[PDB]
Write a protein that binds this ligand. Sequence first.
Ligand code: CL
Ligand code: CL
Ligand code: CL
Ligand code: CL
Ligand code: K
Ligand code: MG
Ligand code: MG
Ligand code: MG
Ligand code: MG
Ligand code: MG
Ligand code: MG
Ligand code: MG
Ligand code: MG
Ligand code: MG
Ligand code: MG
Ligand code: MG
Ligand code: MG
Ligand code: MG
Ligand code: MG
Ligand code: MG
Ligand code: MG
Ligand code: MG
Ligand code: NA
Ligand code: NA
Ligand code: NA
Ligand code: NA
Ligand code: NA
Ligand code: NA
Ligand code: NA
Ligand code: SR
Ligand code: SR
Ligand code: SR
Ligand code: SR
Ligand code: SR
Ligand code: SR
Ligand code: SR
Ligand code: SR
Ligand code: SR
Ligand code: SR
Ligand code: SR
Ligand code: SR
Ligand code: SR
Ligand code: SR
Lengths: 92, 237, 194, 56
Amino acid sequence: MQMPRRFNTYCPHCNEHQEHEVEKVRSGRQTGMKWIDRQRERNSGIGNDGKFSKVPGGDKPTKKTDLKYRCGECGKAHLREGWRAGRLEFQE
Amino acid sequence: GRRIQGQRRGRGTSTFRAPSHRYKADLEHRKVEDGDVIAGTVVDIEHDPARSAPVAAVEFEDGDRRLILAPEGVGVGDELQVGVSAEIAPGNTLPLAEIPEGVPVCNVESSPGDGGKFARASGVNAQLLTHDRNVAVVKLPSGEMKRLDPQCRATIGVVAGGGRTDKPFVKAGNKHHKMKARGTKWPNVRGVAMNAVDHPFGGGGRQHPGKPKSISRNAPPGRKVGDIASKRTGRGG
Amino acid sequence: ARSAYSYIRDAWKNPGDGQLAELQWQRQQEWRNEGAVERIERPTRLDKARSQGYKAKQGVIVARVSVRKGSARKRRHKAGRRSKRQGVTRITRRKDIQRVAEERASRTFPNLRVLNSYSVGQDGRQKWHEVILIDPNHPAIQNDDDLSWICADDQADRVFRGLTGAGRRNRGLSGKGKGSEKTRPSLRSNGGKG
Amino acid sequence: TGAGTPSQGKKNTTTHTKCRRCGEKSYHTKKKVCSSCGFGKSAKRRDYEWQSKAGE
RNA sequence: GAAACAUCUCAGUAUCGGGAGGAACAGAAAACGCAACGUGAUGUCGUUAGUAACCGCGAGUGAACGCGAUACAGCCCAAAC
RNA sequence: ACUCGUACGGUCACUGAAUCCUGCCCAGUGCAGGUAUCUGAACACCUCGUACAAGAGGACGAAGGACCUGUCAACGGCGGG
RNA sequence: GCUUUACUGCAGGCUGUCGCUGAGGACUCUCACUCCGGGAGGAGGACACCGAUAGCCGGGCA
Ligand SMILES: [Cl-]
Ligand SMILES: [Cl-]
Ligand SMILES: [Cl-]
Ligand SMILES: [Cl-]
Ligand SMILES: [K+]
Ligand SMILES: [Mg+2]
Ligand SMILES: [Mg+2]
Ligand SMILES: [Mg+2]
Ligand SMILES: [Mg+2]
Ligand SMILES: [Mg+2]
Ligand SMILES: [Mg+2]
Ligand SMILES: [Mg+2]
Ligand SMILES: [Mg+2]
Ligand SMILES: [Mg+2]
Ligand SMILES: [Mg+2]
Ligand SMILES: [Mg+2]
Ligand SMILES: [Mg+2]
Ligand SMILES: [Mg+2]
Ligand SMILES: [Mg+2]
Ligand SMILES: [Mg+2]
Ligand SMILES: [Mg+2]
Ligand SMILES: [Mg+2]
Ligand code: NA
Ligand code: NA
Ligand code: NA
Ligand code: NA
Ligand code: NA
Ligand code: NA
Ligand code: NA
Ligand SMILES: [Sr+2]
Ligand SMILES: [Sr+2]
Ligand SMILES: [Sr+2]
Ligand SMILES: [Sr+2]
Ligand SMILES: [Sr+2]
Ligand SMILES: [Sr+2]
Ligand SMILES: [Sr+2]
Ligand SMILES: [Sr+2]
Ligand SMILES: [Sr+2]
Ligand SMILES: [Sr+2]
Ligand SMILES: [Sr+2]
Ligand SMILES: [Sr+2]
Ligand SMILES: [Sr+2]
Ligand SMILES: [Sr+2]
């Protein structure tokens, strides 16, 4: 399906109706300064590790929607419930 | 599985060892100071059980009886010379520098004064080629060019007992008799006639190897069977 | 002013710079050729020895020792040990090289007890340590106000039981408060979680 | 030749004899080592913790 | 055991190598951190507490400071000169 | 250990006296060689980040792999239309 | 018990790197270290051996 770039909707961190920009969410670079990030460095040793002795998994014949809705006056984003989108094209 | 035959080998048990107690001598060279003032008369020609070819019993000037490796032709009564300025006669031991070029030589040393390492078997020889101030190139029985130190001693002449491998064994009895006196387990059961538990080529409902015969040089002891690091196989093509 | 001893202490702070550098290059050539345990008349580090308890007295022995370098001379598994219990070259032991050194030295001298030890250097294939030993039966020590404790029956084979200064340090008994709940009074009493 | 009764005929060898140290017929006279007390192998006496049930 | 199993558990258990004594080990703070104007070597008993902590965060693993008690004990070198 | 041994040697495999022969294929797997170029770990080096640490990128680059060649008395193959 | 391109790991081989380890991206030396000679001395040379780490291969083994 297609879904526009800038549309007038709600935002709970604004309390009114402003033009929301629909942008694809880029992840983020791992610094490695978390709890389980250290478990891969401390809890790991010679032969087998259980959960650390694995490889990345697969998927369904369709992935959901992970979008960010930044508005016009404030630019705040609300995390909306993602639907099983096949291919998303932002008009204009 | 179980340790293969070649693994049981390195353990060094009776079955795999050589009957050393039944062997004659550790054929090495004599220690002359510098001058060649040593010579010796060949008194006897004995048989060496360790290496099949004949071995000469030499009594020296100072009465030191030692068994030396026998070159072709040399017999009882003959005199040979060991040292630096020795005669260029067959059977004389002298360093490579003092030996002329294009001469078939045997009992060649690797490092000077080791007692001989190369060209020792029944009827083999070594060709001396280049002469520099630093190097003395020798062509070993396999055809390899060994860049040797000119201070390395060597005996002039080809080894005696030549053309031995040119006559067949005819019967297993002759092979049995030979192998009993060496450091080898005999007979040779093919790895393919064994069980999967005993060798990498074992098992199967018929006889054939599992994987291809050629194996990596990085292969561990127990998996290193068949054609070890083959650059090729076969005859023609 | 400074002690002459303090000039050996200050030299050994950097056993690879200057006069000691050229010394240890020379000594180790003879040491590599020397045995496992060699009794030596005088120590290599005077300050350290004296600091540990060495006196120039009758029945106060010093001996150099050399132990192999690295981790454990650990083999592989004959019987079925899992993936975790299959490390051959990646695992080490629970007794440091100095403790092996002290033990090898106390067995070479089956009547003398270990006082203390220290390091006298190392090269690529071995580690050297000098061990101070005392004779408990010599009257020269039996009437010594600074060393007669080592003559007590309960101090017999004190290295093997880990009652050495080098021993208590490996046993994790240095700290008096935190992270020493599983190490004091003894490891064995604490189920071996030290 | 069957591994049972007929192979029992070739049994005229002396191996285990009365020991000097302990006195049990466990001194292997060909090995000069005792299988009960360990004479000829150790300076100490052959005792083992499994010669009794764990908590005893 | 984890209802399979690999990290984990069984467990520093079994068994093995070394060594001491009537008991052993520990021990007079580079401590504790009920943060204080506070305690004042070390074992052990009770409690703290199945707490804090760990862990395919699963099965399970698990202290300590303090407190109350038992018994009390405190010293010797290295160096300076 | 082989080895008081040295390529007319001993090691690892296969076939199984003699006699007459032993065709074709190196695409896949194996082994071996080469490799301009791609890929390629940690260390050290460079940039930013931290009064330091954690940390983000870059630069370089081995065996190896890609890739090319050699080999079937090497594992093997010799069909349909 | 056995097989393997099942899972995961370990030996082991190959390779870079740090220590051993010295003097003046290609090289000279000798002094450590190694080997050989009875010895004199000869060969090799900061490489090799060994300790540590890193990537590849790895039913030889669990
Ligand atoms: Cl999306
Ligand atoms: Cl043969
Ligand atoms: Cl002791
Ligand atoms: Cl308090
Ligand atoms: K287990
Ligand atoms: Mg197998
Ligand atoms: Mg035999
Ligand atoms: Mg010989
Ligand atoms: Mg056969
Ligand atoms: Mg069969
Ligand atoms: Mg056949
Ligand atoms: Mg076949
Ligand atoms: Mg206790
Ligand atoms: Mg179960
Ligand atoms: Mg655990
Ligand atoms: Mg589960
Ligand atoms: Mg536990
Ligand atoms: Mg606490
Ligand atoms: Mg047949
Ligand atoms: Mg053919
Ligand atoms: Mg030697
Ligand atoms: Mg298996
Ligand atoms: Na940890
Ligand atoms: Na002793
Ligand atoms: Na179950
Ligand atoms: Na099961
Ligand atoms: Na777990
Ligand atoms: Na092919
Ligand atoms: Na079975
Ligand atoms: Sr951990
Ligand atoms: Sr692992
Ligand atoms: Sr699907
Ligand atoms: Sr020799
Ligand atoms: Sr020789
Ligand atoms: Sr087979
Ligand atoms: Sr052909
Ligand atoms: Sr019968
Ligand atoms: Sr009999
Ligand atoms: Sr014995
Ligand atoms: Sr016992
Ligand atoms: Sr008190
Ligand atoms: Sr035939
Ligand atoms: Sr091919």
